[PDB]
Amino acid sequence: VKNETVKLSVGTVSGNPGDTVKVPVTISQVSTPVGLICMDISYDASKFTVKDVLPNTDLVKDTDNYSFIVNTSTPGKISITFTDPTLANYPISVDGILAYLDFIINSNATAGDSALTVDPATLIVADENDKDIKDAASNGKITVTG
Amino acid sequence: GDLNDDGVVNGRDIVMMRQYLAGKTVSGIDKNALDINGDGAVNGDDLMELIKKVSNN
Ligand SMILES: [Ca+2]
Ligand SMILES: [Ca+2]
C-alpha cells in the first residue's frame, strides 16, 4: 500500500547567515508515470531569500519548452509546475530529485530550525492522461547555525 | 486562462491548452477561455500567455 502513493519530499539542510544552501525536492515511490506536478513550498522570508529554483535535468526534460515553471512572485512562497510539453515522451517515470531550491540565509537570520512546508491542499500530481494519481508531501527544513 | 473553469489558473490549464494544441478533443474545456490574447486565434501565443500567468501572477 505504501508504494502506491507518490511522495514529494523537501530536504533538510543547514547553514550560517550569509551563505547559500541547496535544498533538494525529491520524488519517490513513483508508480504511474507522472505528467503533471503543481506544488507550493512555503518558507520564512524574514530568514531566507530565494536565489533560484533549478530542475534536475536527469528527470526534468524539455525545459526549453516550459516543462518547469517557477513562480516566486509571492515572498515566502515557491510554486513549482512540472509538465511534459510533448504529452508523451518525458513523463517522470522513476524516483529521483525533482529540483533544488537555492536559498540565501539572510544576514539577520536567527538560529534554529525553520520549516519548508508543502501545502497539501494545492498539491497536484497527475498521470500522462490527466488522471489524478495518489500523492503525498513531506516537509523539510533549514537549520540556521554558526 | 482558466480552461477547466475551476477558479484558478495553474498547471492543469496548461496541460489542457497543450492537449488542445496537439489536436486532442479535450473534455470539459471552456472554449471562451482559450483565446487568452483575444486575437481571434488559439495558438502557441495563447499558451505562452498562460505560462506567463502561471509563472508570474
Ligand atoms: Ca483552472
Ligand atoms: Ca489568441
From TrEMBL, chain A:
Q: What is this protein called?
A: Probably cellulosomal scaffolding protein, secreted cellulose-binding and cohesin domain
Q: Which organism is it from?
A: Clostridium acetobutylicum (strain ATCC 824 / DSM 792 / JCM 1419 / IAM 19013 / LMG 5710 / NBRC 13948 / NRRL B-527 / VKM B-1787 / 2291 / W)
TrEMBL record, chain B:
Task: Provide the binding site for Ca(2+) 1.
Answer: 2, 4, 6, 8, 13
Coiled-coil blocks: none
Superkingdom of the source species:
Bacteria
Q: Where is the Dockerin domain?
A: 1-57
Provide the residue positions that the database annotates as binding Ca(2+) 2: 35, 37, 39, 41, 46
Record-given protein name:
And cellulose-binding endoglucanase family 9 CelL ortholog dockerin domain
Q: Look up and give the organism this protein is from.
A: Clostridium acetobutylicum (strain ATCC 824 / DSM 792 / JCM 1419 / IAM 19013 / LMG 5710 / NBRC 13948 / NRRL B-527 / VKM B-1787 / 2291 / W)
